[PDB]
Design a protein around this ligand. Structure first.
Ligand SMILES: Nc1ncnc2c1ncn2[C@@H]1O[C@H](COP(=O)(O)OP(=O)(O)O)[C@@H](O)[C@H]1O
Ligand SMILES: [Mg+2]
Lengths: 102, 95, 76
């Protein structure tokens, strides 16, 4: 829905359309809105990667929301737990190494 | 390298069976062995593990980090091959 | 060689059942002996085992490592 001059995404899943309503695909303009942050943590956002299905929309995360509680990284033996651990902790823990990894 | 060879995996220690990074499995006879053999896999599935009971002599199932997908391979017969050191009753009964 | 003809094999450890070469099953009704026989009985054979209740006089089934597929053997 429109808020002031752009749009916003809500996560309520009981609203359904009426019979006879047309169907349209989703453009990248409407895909950016679904995978965005709440208009106020933009200066405090970190870039991680891009979505898989369309590889056109970037992904951002909030610093305060990520490194505030328990964080977990999973995997399988003989599958890259060492490799994935190294790569992810390399790309995530560069600018602020002050966190603790015992 | 450590290589474990036996004929009763279901009665083998779980950690012994889990010290492998690649696999080359031959025929296993009994059906009851599959109860604890279901854990043996680490990078496979159930669609190819169900045809080990009917695996003939010389064939094997290979899956691991060296294969893109699990395959059933027919290994060639070695030349020369192994020999036997046990006799037969007919040879003795000849007198 | 060990060919023991007995009707109470449960007193033997079940680990030895794996080295046998042929399995025989006459009219069995007692729980323990039939359960022990099924404890190490080759899979894929259920219909002939459950129909034992209707066996006529002298009818029996015998197969194993020497009989590749199940057979209903009536000794001459
Ligand atoms: N820079 C890279 N470029 C492409 N592939 C990579 C790179 N670094 C690692 N990989 C891949 O990641 C996989 C990691 O698996 P591996 O670390 O061997 O699993 P495990 O550590 O559980 O044994 C490897 O197969 C490797 O091909
Ligand atoms: Mg690992």
């Amino acid at each position: 829905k429109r808020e002031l001059n752009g749009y916003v995404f809500i996560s309520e899943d009981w609203r359904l359309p009426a019979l006879g309503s047309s169907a349209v695909p989703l453009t990248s303009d409407f895909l950016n809105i679904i995978y965005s942050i709440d208009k106020e943590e933009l200066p405090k956002a970190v870039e991680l990667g891009v979505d898989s299905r369309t590889k056109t929309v970037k992904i951002f995360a909030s610093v305060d929301k990520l490194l505030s509680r328990h964080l977990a990284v999973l995997g399988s033996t003989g599958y890259g737990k060492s490799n994935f651990n190294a790569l992810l902790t390399r790309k995530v823990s560069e600018k602020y190494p002050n966190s603790r990894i015992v | 390298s450590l290589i474990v060879s036996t004929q009763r995996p279901s009665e083998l220690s779980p950690t012994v069976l889990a010290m492998c990074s690649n696999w080359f499995s031959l025929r296993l006879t009994n059906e009851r062995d599959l109860q604890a053999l279901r854990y043996a896999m680490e990078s496979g599935n159930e669609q190819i593990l169900k045809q080990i009971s009917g695996l003939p002599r010389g064939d094997a199932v290979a899956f691991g980090s060296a294969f893109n997908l699990p395959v059933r391979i027919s290994i060639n017969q070695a030349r020369p091959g192994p020999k036997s050191s046990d006799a037969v009753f007919s040879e003795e009964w000849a007198n």
